[PDB]
Design an enzyme around this catalytic site. Structure first.
Site, mmCIF file in Angstrom:
data_model
loop_
_atom_site.group_PDB
_atom_site.id
_atom_site.type_symbol
_atom_site.label_atom_id
_atom_site.label_comp_id
_atom_site.label_asym_id
_atom_site.label_seq_id
_atom_site.Cartn_x
_atom_site.Cartn_y
_atom_site.Cartn_z
ATOM 1 C CD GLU A 117 -45.495 -2.503 59.915
ATOM 2 O OE1 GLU A 117 -45.497 -2.055 58.761
ATOM 3 O OE2 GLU A 117 -46.220 -3.450 60.242
ATOM 4 C CD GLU A 203 -47.105 -10.252 58.728
ATOM 5 O OE1 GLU A 203 -45.877 -10.435 58.837
ATOM 6 O OE2 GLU A 203 -47.619 -9.469 57.907
HETATM 7 O O1 LIG Z 1 -63.967 -1.438 55.239
HETATM 8 C C1 LIG Z 1 -63.628 -2.653 55.887
HETATM 9 C C2 LIG Z 1 -63.143 -2.320 57.279
HETATM 10 O O2 LIG Z 1 -61.902 -1.632 57.136
HETATM 11 C C3 LIG Z 1 -61.299 -1.566 58.407
HETATM 12 O O3 LIG Z 1 -60.017 -0.904 58.150
HETATM 13 C C4 LIG Z 1 -58.968 -1.792 57.701
HETATM 14 C C5 LIG Z 1 -58.349 -1.273 56.420
HETATM 15 O O4 LIG Z 1 -59.289 -1.365 55.349
HETATM 16 C C6 LIG Z 1 -57.150 -2.096 56.027
HETATM 17 O O5 LIG Z 1 -56.472 -1.438 54.948
HETATM 18 C C7 LIG Z 1 -56.191 -2.207 57.196
HETATM 19 O O6 LIG Z 1 -55.202 -3.165 56.871
HETATM 20 C C8 LIG Z 1 -53.940 -3.047 57.564
HETATM 21 C C9 LIG Z 1 -53.954 -3.969 58.793
HETATM 22 O O7 LIG Z 1 -54.747 -3.444 59.861
HETATM 23 C C10 LIG Z 1 -52.568 -4.170 59.398
HETATM 24 O O8 LIG Z 1 -52.589 -5.180 60.399
HETATM 25 C C11 LIG Z 1 -51.574 -4.555 58.322
HETATM 26 O O9 LIG Z 1 -50.284 -4.464 58.895
HETATM 27 C C12 LIG Z 1 -49.247 -5.104 58.119
HETATM 28 C C13 LIG Z 1 -48.304 -4.050 57.571
HETATM 29 O O10 LIG Z 1 -48.957 -3.257 56.566
HETATM 30 C C14 LIG Z 1 -46.989 -4.622 56.998
HETATM 31 O O11 LIG Z 1 -46.090 -3.572 56.660
HETATM 32 C C15 LIG Z 1 -46.362 -5.528 58.037
HETATM 33 O O12 LIG Z 1 -45.270 -6.181 57.474
HETATM 34 O O13 LIG Z 1 -47.319 -6.534 58.392
HETATM 35 C C16 LIG Z 1 -48.483 -6.009 59.066
HETATM 36 C C17 LIG Z 1 -49.312 -7.159 59.572
HETATM 37 O O14 LIG Z 1 -49.790 -7.989 58.511
HETATM 38 O O15 LIG Z 1 -51.618 -3.580 57.287
HETATM 39 C C18 LIG Z 1 -52.871 -3.538 56.599
HETATM 40 C C19 LIG Z 1 -52.683 -2.551 55.420
HETATM 41 O O16 LIG Z 1 -51.438 -2.690 54.753
HETATM 42 C C20 LIG Z 1 -51.545 -3.797 53.783
HETATM 43 O O17 LIG Z 1 -52.582 -3.434 52.862
HETATM 44 C C21 LIG Z 1 -52.248 -2.257 52.100
HETATM 45 C C22 LIG Z 1 -50.929 -2.519 51.351
HETATM 46 O O18 LIG Z 1 -50.599 -1.379 50.566
HETATM 47 C C23 LIG Z 1 -49.798 -2.869 52.303
HETATM 48 O O19 LIG Z 1 -48.603 -3.204 51.577
HETATM 49 C C24 LIG Z 1 -50.218 -4.077 53.114
HETATM 50 O O20 LIG Z 1 -49.147 -4.413 54.031
HETATM 51 O O21 LIG Z 1 -56.861 -2.737 58.346
HETATM 52 C C25 LIG Z 1 -57.888 -1.829 58.776
HETATM 53 C C26 LIG Z 1 -58.341 -2.300 60.141
HETATM 54 O O22 LIG Z 1 -57.244 -2.162 61.070
HETATM 55 C C27 LIG Z 1 -57.637 -2.088 62.426
HETATM 56 O O23 LIG Z 1 -58.135 -3.340 62.889
HETATM 57 C C28 LIG Z 1 -57.163 -4.387 62.831
HETATM 58 C C29 LIG Z 1 -55.989 -4.045 63.756
HETATM 59 O O24 LIG Z 1 -55.097 -5.146 63.848
HETATM 60 C C30 LIG Z 1 -55.332 -2.796 63.212
HETATM 61 O O25 LIG Z 1 -54.246 -2.391 64.065
HETATM 62 C C31 LIG Z 1 -56.407 -1.690 63.234
HETATM 63 O O26 LIG Z 1 -55.859 -0.479 62.668
HETATM 64 C C32 LIG Z 1 -62.108 -0.626 59.261
HETATM 65 O O27 LIG Z 1 -61.416 -0.444 60.495
HETATM 66 C C33 LIG Z 1 -63.453 -1.279 59.506
HETATM 67 O O28 LIG Z 1 -64.291 -0.455 60.313
HETATM 68 C C34 LIG Z 1 -64.102 -1.492 58.143
HETATM 69 O O29 LIG Z 1 -65.354 -2.195 58.257
#
Ligand SMILES: OC[C@H]1O[C@@H](O[C@H]2[C@H](O)[C@@H](O)[C@H](O[C@H]3[C@H](O)[C@@H](O)[C@H](O[C@H]4[C@H](O)[C@@H](O)[C@H](O)O[C@@H]4CO)O[C@@H]3CO[C@H]3OC[C@@H](O)[C@H](O)[C@H]3O)O[C@@H]2CO[C@H]2OC[C@@H](O)[C@H](O)[C@H]2O)[C@H](O)[C@@H](O)[C@@H]1O
Length: 222
Positions: A117, A203
């Site tokens: 990333e 963020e």
């Molecule tokens: O069931 C509910 C709905 O779920 C949707 O899917 C979502 C997942 O459930 C989430 O896990 C997922 O979250 C990630 C999010 O999309 C990212 O923007 C975010 O990115 C972080 C990144 O991890 C971090 O390294 C960086 O520094 O900062 C960015 C921005 O903040 O990451 C999220 C997951 O990682 C975090 O949570 C897990 C931890 O272990 C980790 O440490 C954390 O960092 O989001 C999806 C949806 O994503 C989609 O839509 C939003 C868009 O912006 C994204 O690009 C798309 O992929 C389903 O899609 C729905 O249908 C469900 O109803």
């Protein structure tokens, strides 16, 4: 009747020209508050939008990443010649702990799990800091007309590289692909990886009565 037009739901979106505007309130469970978002205008590869929010609790935990995401076919880095982008924005609010950042992902395959990333922060507000295994830079390169502080650290089974502007940058234009070239040349990132995601948003950690206004944002891949 006239109604609230901004969208506020955790996973709400809008389609706007070449973009999806995602609410992406992925971290809302870490605190208390709310966030509402709307498109102001769009035309092809340009969008204007805003988001407003208040978040409390979970001080070190990101609450959301409202962002404009380019719709494009995942493409290997060695097929990309440039990714021109422009971004003009401003923030209002109190005690804002947040970033304003590009968020991008590289994977071995177009449909596969992410491996790297790469974030490009135009602002670190209220003491917000990037993921970093040391708390210090690994390099301080000049790229696309800005002096950056480069950090690295893990997030699960991915490595996150964050380039953080030396000073808050409300108006930016340059070639985003230069950051990928930098990591291919200097950090051993393979140019055979697929770029899967090109997002630009904010963020929040904590703050109150905040509003990000994105007056102009554009990006394309050549
Ligand atoms: O069931 C509910 C709905 O779920 C949707 O899917 C979502 C997942 O459930 C989430 O896990 C997922 O979250 C990630 C999010 O999309 C990212 O923007 C975010 O990115 C972080 C990144 O991890 C971090 O390294 C960086 O520094 O900062 C960015 C921005 O903040 O990451 C999220 C997951 O990682 C975090 O949570 C897990 C931890 O272990 C980790 O440490 C954390 O960092 O989001 C999806 C949806 O994503 C989609 O839509 C939003 C868009 O912006 C994204 O690009 C798309 O992929 C389903 O899609 C729905 O249908 C469900 O109803």
């Amino acid at each position: 009747l006239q109604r609230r037009s901004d969208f506020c739901g955790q996973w709400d979106t809008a389609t706007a020209g070449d973009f999806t505007l995602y609410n992406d309130l992925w971290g809302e469970s870490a605190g208390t508050g709310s966030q509402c978002t709307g498109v102001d205008s769009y035309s092809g590869d340009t969008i204007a939008w805003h988001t407003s929010w208040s978040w409390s609790g979970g001080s070190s935990s990101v609450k959301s990443y409202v962002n404009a995401a380019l719709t494009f076919t995942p493409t290997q880095l060695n097929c990309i010649s440039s990714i021109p982008t422009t971004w003009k924005w401003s923030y209002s609010g109190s005690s804002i702990v947040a970033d304003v950042a590009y968020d991008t992902f590289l994977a071995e395959t177009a449909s596969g799990s992410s491996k790297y990333e790469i974030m490009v922060w135009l602002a670190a507000l209220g003491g917000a800091g990037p993921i970093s295994s040391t708390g210090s830079t690994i390099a301080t390169p000049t790229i696309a007309g800005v002096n950056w502080k480069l950090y690295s650290g893990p997030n699960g089974d991915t490595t996150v590289y964050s380039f953080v502007a030396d000073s808050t940058t409300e108006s930016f234009s340059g070639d985003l692909n230069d950051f990928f070239t930098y990591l291919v040349d200097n950090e051993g990132v393979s140019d055979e990886l697929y770029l899967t995601t090109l997002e630009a948003g904010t963020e929040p950690f904590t703050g109150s009565n905040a509003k990000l206004t994105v007056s102009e944002y554009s990006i394309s891949i050549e």
